[PDB]
């Protein structure tokens, strides 16, 4: 009945988890996520760059168990809007999560089902506590890859549809060379 | 309704988490743990050095929640036996754990209730997955502190009792300049 313990090497400098499952999100995988649709179409047809990669070590979906995954969020903008992850709530709403920032400059945008928002700035050494019930997205606000490690219950799941449906209440943009969190003009209510 | 999300800074060089709860284990606190009881007596009377320190950020004991803690495990030997953490089962047996090595050279010893044992070497960048039902102890096999971060369920709790009397089935020693994992002389059922 007892499962096999294991260790894996993580390269903090590159985010790569040796032997883990890898996922790639390119800009073309993110249709309807950025405000500036035209700058999105423009970049997709010109370059279709990698927005982010995930290396994930995941267990069977059972209570008490834990998963972990690194994300490499590459630097870039879609118009004025910084590259980010698609973002999600968890399928189970009574599940928290911990992020450990490893390299680069970024932050996490967070929101409840109602629409109340939170921004937490992330730099190397930052550990962020993601409480039960908050959807969460990370954003790279710098010019180098933003790299972090996430630890999360094996049974949490992922609800993306709700974020693909409504987006987040706030957006993170650069404006006069200054980084700002402001209202999403597309937002529901 | 809804807990605040938060970030705290963790210094990967020192293990220090600003404002977290600091716990100190000194060698006197570990009577009956090391094989060589007379080296134990001697080092205690002569110094009572700190074996390890813990910086824990903990939530109430609710299922789905997560705690994180750093340990700084200092270098040393009680006789041939390297410095370790006391070790424990989780009070809710079916709760996993994830460790991230930050500094120094070390490893983890792991044991089932019936007594299956495993050794997992740890260096900067190693991530160790601790399955449900496995007791776990970390050991510093080098000359500088062994610093790691752990993330665990808020309701996992601790079973120290079992380990204190039965011990671990294997021990980690220096011999003729060589690090070895061998049978534990003080071990029965
Ligand atoms: O578990 C998490 O929350 C993260 O590992 C994310 O899955 C990862 O950062 C990729 O983002 P998303 O799942 O929002 O595409
Ligand atoms: O949660 C854990 O498993 C760790 O944070 C340990 O408690 C920590 O390393 C100290 O060891 P122990 O609790 O065995 O004294
Ligand atoms: Mn998540
Ligand atoms: Mn533990």
From Swiss-Prot, chains A, B:
Protein name: Glucose-6-phosphate isomerase
Gene: pgiA
Matches recorded under SUPFAM superfamilies: RmlC-like cupins (SSF51182)
Keywords assigned: Cytoplasm, Gluconeogenesis, Glycolysis, Iron, Isomerase, Metal-binding
Reactions accelerated catalytically: alpha-D-glucose 6-phosphate = beta-D-fructose 6-phosphate
Regulation: Inhibited by mannose 6-phosphate, fructose 1-phosphate and fructose 1,6-bisphosphate.
Protein's pathway: Carbohydrate degradation; glycolysis; D-glyceraldehyde 3-phosphate and glycerone phosphate from D-glucose: step 2/4
GO molecular function: glucose-6-phosphate isomerase activity; iron ion binding
EC numbers, comma separated: 5.3.1.9
Activity across pH: Optimum pH is 7.0.
Cofactor or coenzyme needed: Fe cation
Gene Ontology annotations of biological process type: gluconeogenesis; glycolytic process
Chief place of localization: cytoplasm
Residue numbers binding Fe cation: 88, 90, 97, 136
Broad enzyme group: isomerase
Thermal dependence, as annotated: Optimum temperature is 90-96 degrees Celsius. Highly thermostable.
Location of this chain's protein in the cell: Cytoplasm
CC cofactor note: Binds 1 Fe cation per subunit.
Assembly behavior: Homodimer.
Domain of life: Archaea
One GO CC term, this protein: cytoplasm
InterPro entries linked: G6P_isomerase_archaea/bacteria, G6P_isomerase_prok, GPI/OXD, RmlC-like_jellyroll, RmlC_Cupin_sf
Protein source organism: Pyrococcus furiosus (strain ATCC 43587 / DSM 3638 / JCM 8422 / Vc1)
Family: Belongs to the archaeal-type GPI family.
């Amino acid at each position: 009945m007892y499962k096999e313990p294991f260790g894996v090497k993580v390269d903090f400098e590159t985010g790569i988890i040796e032997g883990a499952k890898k996922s790639v999100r390119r800009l073309s995988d993110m249709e309807g996520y950025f405000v500036d649709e035209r700058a999105w179409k423009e970049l997709v047809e010109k370059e279709d760059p990698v927005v982010y990669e995930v290396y994930a070590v995941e267990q069977e979906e059972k209570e008490g168990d834990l998963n972990f995954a690194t994300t490499v969020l590459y630097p870039g903008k879609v118009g004025k809007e910084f590259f980010f992850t698609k973002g999600h709530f968890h399928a189970k709403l009574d599940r928290a999560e911990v992020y450990v920032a490893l390299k680069g400059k970024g932050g996490m945008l967070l929101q409840t089902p109602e629409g109340d928002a939170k921004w937490i700035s992330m730099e190397p050494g930052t550990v962020v506590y993601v409480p039960r019930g908050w959807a969460h997205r990370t954003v790279n606000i710098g010019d180098e890859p933003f790299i972090f490690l996430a630890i999360y219950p094996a049974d949490a799941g992922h609800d993306y549809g709700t974020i693909a449906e409504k987006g987040f209440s706030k957006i993170v943009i650069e404006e006069n060379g200054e980084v700002k969190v402001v209202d999403n003009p597309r937002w529901k209510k």
